[PDB]
Design a protein around this ligand. Structure first.
Ligand SMILES: Nc1ncc(C#Cc2c(F)ccc(NS(=O)(=O)c3cc(Cl)cc(CO)c3Cl)c2F)cn1
Length: 242
């Protein structure tokens, strides 16, 4: 009702393991929003209501803007967010991010910004990857899609680390940063093999074809989490623009 009464749908934006995200217009503002709708078994889910509570409270220029969350009668939970016009980092990676080194670095920064904020509120994303990082109409990172059935209090295989510790997201960032700083990997066999190589237990292994990027991703991907830098610690490293 509230969904259908007050919104019109425009485009399936994505489909999750749980339920979908629909780009919609609001009747009254006329504003486009993204809306996760999840089918829900009231009493089980208590996790979810938890992560809703937990995620509502996040405010950052590098998080997707929250708007509202409600339920409609037995079934569904809706979550209304900012609709980022430039889609995902994935799209941006696949259309030649490695080319623009200036842009590459800036975005990487914004992500770190986000992770720091998340980390200092005592929180972890865990489901971090380029499909889960969006881009506003001003081409700024908006991190999102935390995972509502996933605990985010600091107490799909390629982005996960070999291990609750903030170090997990910074591993993922190395995988991500690599892809940002690399040519689009046309083949699936390519994507998969190349990244399996970044995840070499003793030491990462890279393509044959960008020198500052190496040292960073090496730091980030360190198999021992204690030799990976904090979002701020790495924001402090001299290995950085602007
Ligand atoms: N282009 C484009 N594509 C997809 C989206 C999106 C989207 C979306 C969505 F529709 C619901 C939820 C989350 N993310 S969440 O992690 O579940 C979360 C939950 C709460 Cl309650 C609060 C916050 C931060 O306050 C977060 Cl991040 C979305 F990312 C936006 N643009």
């Amino acid at each position: 009702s509230r969904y259908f009464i007050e919104f019109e749908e425009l485009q399936l934006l994505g489909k999750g393991a749980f339920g979908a995200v629909i780009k919609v217009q609001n009747k009254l503002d006329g504003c486009c929003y993204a809306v996760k709708r999840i089918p829900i078994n009231p009493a089980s889910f208590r996790r979810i209501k938890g992560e809703v509570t937990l995620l509502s409270r996040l405010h950052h220029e590098n998080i997707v803007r929250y708007y509202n969350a409600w339920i409609e009668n037995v079934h569904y939970l809706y979550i209304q967010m900012e609709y980022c016009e430039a889609s995902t980092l994935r799209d941006t990676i696949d259309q030649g991010l490695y080319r623009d080194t200036v842009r590459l670095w800036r975005l990487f920064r914004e992500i770190l910004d986000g992770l720091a904020y998340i980390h200092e509120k005592g929180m972890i994303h865990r489901n971090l990857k380029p499909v889960n990082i969006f881009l506003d109409s001003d081409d700024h990172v908006k991190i999102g899609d935390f995972g509502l059935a996933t605990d985010h209090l600091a107490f799909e295989a390629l982005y996960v680390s070999p291990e609750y510790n903030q170090k997990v997201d910074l591993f993922s960032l190395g995988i991500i940063f690599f892809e940002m700083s690399y040519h689009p990997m046309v083949t699936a066999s390519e994507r998969i093999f190349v990244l399996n190589q970044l995840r070499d237990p003793t030491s990462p292994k890279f393509p044959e074809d960008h020198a500052k990027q190496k040292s960073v991703i090496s730091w980030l991907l360190n198999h021992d989490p204690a030799k990976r830098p904090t979002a701020t610690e790495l924001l402090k490293s001299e290995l950085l623009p602007p």
